[PDB]
């Protein structure tokens, strides 16, 4: 049907603010946001892969795209989260 | 194994008459004395952003030499497409 | 007799014509290269550069600055002045959305 | 056992993988790429919700509304940079009056 | 129909923009600017509608038109 | 009778309208304008309601941003009243 | 080391429009950059069009709509005219 | 086998239809590509090339030069409103700018 990130947004919200809710419009805005950043990152990764004549998008391409896309401290923290997640998943 | 002299104060190589000449191309007839430092700062910021992106591309390819194509892509993704340096 | 001495502004205008007619790069090659290498060194040490990469960077920098000076001049003229000042640059960059 | 559970994440890794496969981005997709991407998206979501919650608490509201999201984004330099060209519907603007306009 | 964008509405918009005093000639100028903006967006929007061989402009059509002009809008997905 | 000085009510309105978020142009005339303009590209078009609301959000946000920049241009010239040449300067520098 | 470019086609067009005019190497390089740029823009816009409508094939229709989106006014009308004429002549 | 005819020749074009087709197939733009799409695309690219070269030739003759150089391309682009719109965010290397002095700066 119509997919959204609503349930995941809600889980994150409960982690960070147990006593805070969210309106329907705000959840819709969050979904728009997530889709936007998704498209940007996937597109940048696509160009990265083409420039280097590689046929596979790997986590390394994701990381480089993240470094291009996000400024400064946001980029560093994102890289930290990505690395921890890949390391925990791998084992 | 005979590296160049450590780079310092190179912002001063952007001389006063050079900035004046650039301003002439922009149609500026008279120039306040304080313009020069401001211009230097702006230029430095611009350069930082470009070089950062270029080097990121260079590292992704696991190369140690920044190429013209690296620069073209960096500029392109900032909406300042440059013609003349392809291939 | 009195030495020949054009009034303030004449030579500036003649320079405007001169430099808008031609296309050669206006900053010295080598100091610019040193600037680029210094800035680059604060991200990763020991990088090398292809010549045409530096020439491309120079084209981009000078074009960007030329555009900034056009907008700065328009901002100065708007305030019924003829001399550009730092606040004009800051207004131009604020409206472009860089700050 | 889900891959998200093995990765310690809340965002759905499987769904992101399917969306990459069908988004015409590349011929192949590595196993780690959707994990990394999901982690980044979850981190950013957490950052925005953190600030928006703070703004909500300043406004003594228990539910985050679009106004709080706009306030949160525009008051953070790096988020504002990231979303410099984004319009939040019903977001309004930041309270801001130029000093020259005040009397005296 | 351009006159339906009334003077007090433009005044209110300017108030949100922080404008304290407004010359009488601003209003007509503003209307012209608005018209141009709308035209461009709508021109693209209808194009998407026509490509889909539909007769109803959808919200998604508008969102895509706005996105491709670099004015991404959140909230209507 | 009591009378407030010029500007006091303007400032009150600034605070009022920056505090809230409701749309400021009337719905129906805006819709009428949209349909009139649309009519000059293709006949007989209809519109979903949420499409018109989206267009209205975009238009008002765009105008608000333009007025911020216009105000900065006016203040730069040491005036407090915005004039058409200010709008034209702002639009030229944005690149439209 | 074989690098393709549009040089020979640019040169043929130049000879069609200005029989006694030449071109420097730098200008030909600029033309190649130009052609690649417009190519990428059009192909990308066409991809988005196809994606939005859940079609898996890019046809001449998508090209035409993309052309109308990217080019302004009379340039767009003339380009559409050329494309349509070319496709109809090709089909016969 | 039938005598080789090129699709560009069948379309009356100068730009290489086959090469454009190959680049579309390998550019990962869509899963499938129609037979008519590269013909249309080639025609549009050829037309735009012709328009730029037309203006650049005019500029070249105005300057009494027989070879088009980048300066002429920059002049051609900035003096045409629709091309200037299309290439509003493009820098032409070695292009310079249009001669232009604000009227208020000239003497009275």
Numbering used by the authors:
A (entry chain H): 33 to 123
B (entry chain F): 16 to 102
C (entry chain E): 36 to 134
D (entry chain G): 15 to 118
E (entry chain B): 25 to 101
F (entry chain A): 38 to 133
G (entry chain D): 32 to 123
H (entry chain C): 11 to 118
Copy text from the publication:
The decameric RAD51 form with the linker DNA binding is observed in the presence of ADP or AMP-PNP. The RAD51 ring forms bind to the nucleosomal DNA and incorporate the linker DNA into the central hole of the ring. Despite the overall structural similarity of the RAD51 promoters in the rings, a notable deviation is seen in protomer 3 of the decameric ring (with the linker DNA binding), in which the NLD orientation differs by 30° as compared with that of protomer 1, owing potentially to a unique nucleosomal DNA interaction. In the context of the RAD51 decameric ring with the linker DNA binding, the L1 loop region of protomer 1 also contributes to the nucleosomal DNA binding, in concert with the Lys64 and Lys70 residues of the NLD. The sequential contacts at the 136th, 134th and 132nd base-pair positions from the distal end of the nucleosomal DNA by the L1 loops of RAD51 protomers 1, 2 and 3, respectively, are distinctive to the decameric ring. These interactions may not be observed in the octameric and nonameric rings, suggesting that the RAD51 decameric ring with the linker DNA binding could be an intermediate form for the structural transition from the ring to the filament. By contrast, in the decameric RAD51 ring, the L1 loops of protomers 7 and 8 capture the DNA near the end. In addition, as shown in Fig. 2h, the L1 loops of the RAD51 decameric ring protomers 1, 2 and 3 bind to the linker DNA proximally to the nucleosome, although they might not bind directly to the DSB site. However, the RAD51(R235D) mutant is markedly defective in both DNA binding and nucleosome binding. These results suggest that, in addition to the key role of the NLD, DNA binding by the L1 loop plays an essential part in nucleosome binding, as seen in the decameric RAD51 ring bound to the nucleosome with the linker DNA.
RAD51 is the central eukaryotic recombinase required for meiotic recombination and mitotic repair of double-strand DNA breaks (DSBs). Here we report the cryo-electron microscopy structures of human RAD51–nucleosome complexes, in which RAD51 forms ring and filament conformations. We found that RAD51 forms multiple conformations in the complex with the nucleosome, such as ring forms with eight (octameric), nine (nonameric) or ten (decameric) protomers, and a filament form. Notably, we found that in all RAD51–nucleosome complexes, the NLDs of RAD51 directly bind to the DNA wrapped in the nucleosome.
